[PDB]
Amino acid sequence: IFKNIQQLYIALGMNINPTITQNIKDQYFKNSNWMQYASLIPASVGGFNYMAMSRCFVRNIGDPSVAALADIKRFIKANLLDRSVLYRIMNQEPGE
């Protein structure tokens, strides 16, 4: 988690990609808890967290979505995330 946070900050502030504008950068740097949410929400549902908690015990976890939602519930119980985060994840817009 610590290295993910550091890498997100590096990618958003000190990278050679010229397409990263300023509005995105200060939107993530100034909105409260946004970097924490980005580093903590699992990647299967939108976030940038790629390590499931059950991956520390078994190699094959099944399908990623169930593990991601179980991890989100565990985060909510541990006060790492709020319930509104789960509601937003459930009500996000679909692709095409």
């Binding site: 990618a11 958003l12 990609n17 397409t19 990263i20 504008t21 995105i24 939107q27 993530y28 909105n31 946004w34 949410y37 980005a38 549902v45 939108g46 976030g47 940038f48 499931a52 908690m53 059950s54 015990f57 078994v58 976890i61 099944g62 399908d63 979505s65 169930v66 593990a67 939602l69 179980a70 519930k73 565990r74 909510i76 319930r83 509104s84 789960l86 509601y87 937003r88 994840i89 459930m90 009500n91 996000q92 817009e93 679909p94 692709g95 095409e96």
Partner: protein, 97 residues
């Protein structure tokens, strides 16, 4: 890809724009998700993760599935299913009892 495209042709600006904008689009999508406004009518945190996955896949695939059922995907994850009891001190297993 660039070398082979130079050798054979067929590349164009509007094709590689998709590759060059990838990370920015990812950040924009996450930011769009994060400032959504939601209500507390449904208590999703009290459901099982399998049911949550089923509901999420029903919501996100609605433009193709409609109301139809998607099966053969969801399996439980180990850390939610299991309950371990270390038996010691001449006491019966609480779950077994």
């Amino acid at each position: 890809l660039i070398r082979v495209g130079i050798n054979r042709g067929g590349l164009t600006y509007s094709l590689l724009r998709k590759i060059s904008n990838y990370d920015l689009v990812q950040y924009e999508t996450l930011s769009r998700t994060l400032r959504l406004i939601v209500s507390d009518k449904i208590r999703y945190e009290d459901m099982c993760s399998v049911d949550l996955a089923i509901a999420l896949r029903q919501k996100m695939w609605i433009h193709l599935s409609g109301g139809r059922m998607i099966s053969g995907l969801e399996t439980p994850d180990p850390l939610e299913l299991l309950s371990g009891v270390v038996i010691t001190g001449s006491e019966h297993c609480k779950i077994c009892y």
